[PDB]
Design a protein around this ligand. Structure first.
Ligand SMILES: [Mg+2]
Ligand SMILES: [Mg+2]
Ligand SMILES: [Mg+2]
Ligand SMILES: [Mg+2]
Ligand SMILES: [Mg+2]
Ligand SMILES: [Mg+2]
Ligand SMILES: [Mg+2]
Ligand SMILES: [Mg+2]
Ligand SMILES: [Mg+2]
Ligand SMILES: [Mg+2]
Ligand SMILES: [Mg+2]
Ligand SMILES: [Mg+2]
Ligand SMILES: [Mg+2]
Ligand SMILES: [Mg+2]
Ligand SMILES: [Mg+2]
Ligand SMILES: [Mg+2]
Ligand SMILES: [Mg+2]
Ligand SMILES: [Mg+2]
Ligand SMILES: [Mg+2]
Length: 73
RNA sequence: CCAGCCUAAACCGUCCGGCUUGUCCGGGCGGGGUCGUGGGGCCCUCGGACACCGAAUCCCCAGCCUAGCCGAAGCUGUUGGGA
């Protein structure tokens, strides 16, 4: 199953990564112990938000320190 | 015998809570949509209100069921216990 781990996992990977693992492992350990979440079409969408949001969030914080770069120099 | 309709989804709006506050996620309500000569959504150009079609829902009556009522024309003999 496709899941989205919200935790630095050893064999799996870092947070926010999407990796397919054996059902039982996620169904009876990851998902239950809150290490990951079933990567449904609903969650993948809510992940595009965390990506795009923080993206233009720092992309705009650098686009603002872009004005101070032009003038303070 | 006779007859065809409603919805899910896209898409727009709202109220609620969840949470990593986000152009989001889900839930409930409303609008939209309903088809095979393919249809619908959103974006453009246009004439439609006063156009027409119209119930399987509601309303009035007719009619009918549950009691009834009117309804023509004869009398004398005669056998017989009795016409
Ligand atoms: Mg959904
Ligand atoms: Mg959605
Ligand atoms: Mg509806
Ligand atoms: Mg929806
Ligand atoms: Mg929804
Ligand atoms: Mg909603
Ligand atoms: Mg739904
Ligand atoms: Mg519903
Ligand atoms: Mg409707
Ligand atoms: Mg429309
Ligand atoms: Mg409709
Ligand atoms: Mg239409
Ligand atoms: Mg059909
Ligand atoms: Mg089409
Ligand atoms: Mg009519
Ligand atoms: Mg009546
Ligand atoms: Mg009567
Ligand atoms: Mg007599
Ligand atoms: Mg007599």
């Amino acid at each position: 199953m496709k899941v989205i781990l919200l935790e630095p996992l050893e064999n799996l990977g870092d947070v926010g990564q999407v990796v397919d693992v054996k059902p039982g492992y996620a169904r009876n350990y990851l998902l239950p112990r809150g290490l990951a979440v079933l990567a449904t079409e609903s969650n993948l969408k809510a992940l595009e938000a965390r990506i795009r949001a923080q993206a233009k969030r720092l992309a705009e914080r650098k686009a603002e320190a872009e004005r101070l770069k032009e003038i303070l120099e």
